[PDB]
């Protein structure tokens, strides 16, 4: 569970990222499709090319769901119910993939915010993303 310090760190990271959220989400998605080709099979009719407008657009949706999770740390499953049914009971997204995206999301932050991505922040962000992943694959357990 996210401690009080973890919430502070997570929200501080969110505030610093600010308006860049959608873009960082699109960058994470691009890192995932490129580093881990298996994930591409989940978006067949998507234009997955570098400047894809559709990846840009999907990045923003992901960032916004993350913002929503950030706002409901203790109410996450209710908060992302639909989203969980979508990935778990419909697309049947491999749980591993969530760890892979979580990782690309951290790589993206570390590339943009080196000074602020300290070990302690890195640990808080990882806990946070694992909580989100737990929920999104929730319908499996």
């Amino acid at each position: 569970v996210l401690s009080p310090a973890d919430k502070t760190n997570v929200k501080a990271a969110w505030g610093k990222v600010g308006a860049h959220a959608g873009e960082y989400g699109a960058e994470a998605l691009e890192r995932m499709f490129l580093s881990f080709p298996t994930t591409k099979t989940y978006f067949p009719h998507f234009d997955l090319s570098h400047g894809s407008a559709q990846v840009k657009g999907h990045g923003k949706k992901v960032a916004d769901a993350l913002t929503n999770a950030v706002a409901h740390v203790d109410d996450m499953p209710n908060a992302l119910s639909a989203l969980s049914d979508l990935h778990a009971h419909k697309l049947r997204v491999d749980p591993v993939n969530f760890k892979l995206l979580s990782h690309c999301l951290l790589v993206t932050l570390a590339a943009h915010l080196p000074a602020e991505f300290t070990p302690a922040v890195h640990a808080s962000l990882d806990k946070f993303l694992a909580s989100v992943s737990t929920v999104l694959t929730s319908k499996y357990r």
Binding site: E27, E30, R31, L34, S35, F36, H103, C104, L106, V107, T108, A110, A111, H112, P114, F117, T118, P119, A120, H122, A123, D126
Partner: protein, 146 residues
Amino acid sequence: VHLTPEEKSAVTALWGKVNVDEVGGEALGRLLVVYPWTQRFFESFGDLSTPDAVMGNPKVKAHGKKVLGAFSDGLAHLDNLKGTFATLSELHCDKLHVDPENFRLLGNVLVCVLAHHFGKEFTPPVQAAYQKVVAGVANALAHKYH
């Protein structure tokens, strides 16, 4: 492991600029901090209960230096990973019994460390190249284990 010419070249280039005395202790420490169960493997190191106590621990730094050393030797024999790593695999698999998932974990922490140090220069394509080299090392480390 099979890298394209531009991947193979991007890896070498970035690696030449890596501070070998720092980056390894940073990946190790971050691993110990982010995945606290891994601390069990290094009790001899002392109190690892705060991130600062971990990041600055002399032993963490010294040992991370040896790990980074092992990766470099992998980047030089990308064609024979099971080779240079035959030795470290027995120490990690037959003696230490480290689950492979943990090798994956450390390989990805290294990638975050590189991203941290290189910023926008650690492009998605360059990350993609390092993810291949990192998965190779992990798999090679997990051979003759189980």
